[PDB]
């Protein structure tokens, strides 16, 4: 098996630059559960909360534009549409609510989940919604007629994170039974199963280019090729548990938010971890409240936005000095698995 270990010593992967802390934005009353960014102009955020609201923050200066109320309970997920001026928010109240960005009033309510719905993802080309939650089923909603067109029977437990892809498998799903399924929706059954995770897969992210996915677990962040469904790579992780979210820059940088408050940055190609940071909790907070609930990159990918459990949004910027003087991180030493 050593031949593989030599083949890990030839590459010397992929230098990148570190990250640092540009800006701190308070202003939520409760926790920040979810964050999404305007896919076109990059001019703002939509941030869920634990206070039921949604507060639309300006990306440029960080000022607060507007407040979108209307959920009775905490908002687990928010997703903004590309081709549409629509905003689909979803909560623990068992409802997926549409939002017309133009006039800022609820348009449609989609009905028929048994219990809280923790993920919405907007299929790129079909005018569909994909919702999922403690139902343990994935519902493909027809955006126009509010008809739960397709239901995907599936994982043996709740469904944490769901994504959409234009070609085959059009829905990737991740559940607390510690599997990740690659779905074929037209026939309505699993195309491929990926079991390699040992515990709940709490987050996924789609690489904007290579047509792959990064899947998470407690201590091990893996990657997966879509299409064939192979494993692609691994990412070197000592115990980071727990991984709340992942985000993939367009430069092939793979972010990992910790529940220990550590921000684990990776290269996507290699699996190498070139940086790990630690956030400052807050003025009056508790050391338990330091963690990262969600995160995203803008359309460019030169800034990072992380909602934290301390009731604050933080904006992490990529250092411009860097280069070879001293960037170098942990420097690519891998222990035998």
């Amino acid at each position: 098996i050593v031949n593989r270990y030599e083949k890990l010593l030839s590459q010397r992967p992929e230098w990148h630059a570190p990250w640092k802390l540009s800006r701190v934005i308070n202003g939520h009353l409760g926790w920040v559960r979810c964050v999404a960014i305007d896919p076109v102009d990059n001019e703002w955020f939509i941030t869920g909360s634990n206070d039921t609201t949604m507060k639309v923050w300006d990306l440029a200066t960080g000022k607060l534009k507007t407040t979108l109320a209307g959920h009775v309970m905490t908002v687990r997920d928010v997703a903004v549409s590309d081709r549409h001026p629509y905003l689909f928010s979803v909560s623990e109240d068992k409802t997926v609510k549409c939002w017309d960005l133009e006039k800022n009033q609820i348009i449609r309510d989609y009905y028929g989940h048994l219990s809280g719905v923790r993920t919405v993802s907007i299929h790129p080309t079909l005018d569909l919604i994909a919702t999922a939650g403690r139902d343990s089923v994935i519902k493909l909603w027809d955006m126009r007629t509010r008809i739960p067109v397709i239901t995907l029977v599936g994982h043996k437990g709740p469904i944490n994170q769901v994504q959409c892809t234009p070609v085959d498998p059009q829905v990737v799903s991740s559940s607390t039974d510690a599997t990740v399924r690659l779905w074929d929706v037209v026939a309505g059954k699993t195309m491929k199963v990926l079991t390699h995770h040992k515990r709940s897969v709490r987050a996924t992210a789609l690489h904007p280019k290579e047509f792959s996915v990064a899947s998470a677990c407690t201590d091990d962040i893996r990657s997966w090729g879509l299409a064939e469904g192979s494993l692609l790579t691994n990412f070197e992780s000592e115990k980071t548990g727990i991984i709340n979210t992942l985000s993939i820059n367009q430069d092939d940088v793979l972010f990992a938010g910790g529940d220990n408050g550590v921000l684990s940055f990776y290269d996507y190609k290699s699996g190498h971890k070139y940086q790990s940071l630690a956030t400052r909790e807050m003025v009056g907070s508790l050391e338990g409240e330091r963690s990262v609930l969600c995160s995203t990159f803008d359309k460019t990918g030169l800034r990072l936005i992380t909602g934290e459990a301390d009731k604050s949004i933080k904006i992490w910027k990529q250092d411009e000095t860097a280069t070879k003087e001293s960037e170098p991180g942990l420097a690519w030493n891998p222990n035998l698995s």
């Binding site: 593989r4 083949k7 890990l8 590459q11 992967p13 992929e14 390699h196 290579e210 047509f211 792959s212 990657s223 090729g225 879509l226 299409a227 192979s230 494993l231 692609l232 790579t233 691994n234 190609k269 290699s270 699996g271």
Partner: peptide, 26 residues
């Protein structure tokens, strides 16, 4: 008879493919 017993599982599913060559393009 080795073929029959575990016939489903096999090793190469455990091993990651990108570690051979990075930049292998999907």
């Amino acid at each position: 008879l080795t073929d029959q017993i575990a016939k489903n599982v096999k090793l190469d599913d455990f091993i990651p493919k990108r570690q051979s060559n990075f930049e292998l393009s999907v």
